Structures are given as structure tokens and as C-alpha cells.
């Protein structure tokens, strides 16, 4: 059900079946890789390791989501062909993806070394999430560029969504610009 909902939201934002399938297929492959790593390490299917996959569903796509977002934006704005748009998008986004992947993989490492049964519980989530994220990063740096360059072609509720998103984006620009001036009142609220 989590997979279905993630696919639904990706469809409701990207508006195209192809654009959604490009990142969607990444999650099954990452989970298969995590299964292989579990077999190699000695882990097993259980409620904890599967709650780990359920939580990972959302985060193991983020890299493909970002790459498809950027390629779509470049194609729409610059009017470039799928290959050139994909190349420019990758050139722009490579570093952010590596940073996000490494940070999100490192955050779960400390939990694994905790002592006690709590550490045993933590290890399942740590292994599942970290391995899935690492596999997704590889599948987004490797496969997604090729798929975007190849399968994609030059180019209701969807139109309303686009217009509303543009309006709220402009409103966010205005609100953020207003907020920048009041930095100290912002910091006190943060404290």
C-alpha cells in the first residue's frame, strides 16, 4: 500500500506515466539488492526488517525524484532535447545526490552499534534502510540518466495543479523575501 501511495503521489505531481515509472522501478531493484545483501550477511525476513522496507519506500526514490524533476525543468525551460537536458540536469545535481545519499546512509549507522536488545532492533532498520539507500543512489546515478535520455520524448486536474503550484511558488518567494528582513525575530522563535 505504501508503494501504491508513493506511485500515486508521484503521478499527481509529474502528471505522466513515464516520468513516474522512471523513479518507480528503482525501489524494487534496490529492495532486491537489499535482499541479496541480507542473504549474504545472514539476516532474514521479519516484521522489523519489513517495517524497515516500508519506511525506506519513500526515501529510496528521492534521488530518482530529484533527477527527473531537474530533467523535466530543463526540458520545459531551455527546450533542450532529452539527451542534452539529461546531461545538464546531471551536471547540476550530481553533488547534491551524493551528499544526500551519504548523509542519509550515515545517520542510521550509529544505531546499529547500540548495546542490548534495543541495538538488535535498531540493526534491522539500519541495514535495510542504509543498503536500500545506497543501492538507490547507484541506480539513480547509473540507470536513471540512461532511461531519461532514451525513453523520454521531446515535448483537467493536472493543469489546475500546475497553475496552483506556480501561484504558491510565487507566494513562497514573496513570503520568504519578507521573512529574510526579520532575522532576529526568526531566531528567537527557533530558540
Amino acid at each position: 500500500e505504501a508503494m501504491v501511495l508513493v506511485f500515486i503521489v508521484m503521478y499527481l505531481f509529474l502528471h505522466n506515466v513515464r516520468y513516474t515509472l522512471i523513479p518507480a522501478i528503482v525501489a524494487p531493484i534496490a529492495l532486491l539488492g537489499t535482499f541479496t545483501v541480507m542473504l549474504l550477511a545472514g539476516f532474514s525476513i521479519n516484521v522489523l526488517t519489513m517495517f524497515g522496507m516500508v519506511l525506506a519506500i519513500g526515501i529510496i526514490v528521492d534521488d530518482a525524484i530529484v533527477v527527473v524533476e531537474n530533467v523535466e525543468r530543463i526540458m520545459a525551460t531551455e527546450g533542450l532535447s532529452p539527451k542534452d537536458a539529461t546531461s545538464k540536469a546531471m551536471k547540476e545535481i550530481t553533488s547534491p545526490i551524493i551528499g544526500i545519499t551519504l548523509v542519509l546512509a550515515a545517520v542510521f549507522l550509529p544505531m546499529a552499534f547500540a548495546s542490548g536488545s534495543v541495538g538488535v532492533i535498531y540493526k534491522q532498520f539500519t541495514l535495510t534502510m542504509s543498503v536500500s539507500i545506497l543501492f538507490s543512489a547507484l541506480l539513480a546515478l547509473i540507470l536513471t540518466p540512461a532511461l531519461c535520455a532514451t525513453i523520454l520524448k521531446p515535448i483537467g486536474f493536472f493543469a489546475w495543479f500546475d497553475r496552483s503550484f506556480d501561484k504558491v511558488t510565487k507566494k513562497y518567494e514573496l513570503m520568504l523575501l519578507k521573512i529574510i528582513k526579520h532575522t532576529v525575530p526568526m531566531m528567537v522563535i527557533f530558540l
Partner: protein
């Protein structure tokens, strides 16, 4: 760079195929349970003294 695979889709597709076919082969050989060994192991010594 990531530009290598943009012009070589086959090489990424075969990598994905390898990952998929190893994962599918591995899944059947994995144990299934509810919880892991998440409880302190216990060993009992029983002694009978008339």
C-alpha cells in the same frame, strides 16, 4: 562520470538485470520469522542431588 551511462543504456540495463536476478534468487533462500534473536540468550544447568 554519470555521462558514461547516458550514451550506454545497455550497460546500465544489464547491471539492473544482474541485481534483479540475484535478488530474486536470494529471496527464496532467506528465513522467515516474526522477530529476530532480540532476547538475551539463556542457558540452563539442571542438577539433581538426592
Amino acid at each position: 562520470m554519470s555521462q558514461f551511462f547516458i550514451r550506454r543504456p545497455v550497460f546500465a540495463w544489464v547491471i539492473a538485470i544482474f541485481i534483479i536476478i540475484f535478488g530474486l534468487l536470494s529471496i527464496p533462500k532467506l528465513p522467515i520469522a516474526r522477530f529476530p534473536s532480540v532476547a538475551p540468550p539463556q542457558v540452563n544447568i539442571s542438577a539433581t542431588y538426592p
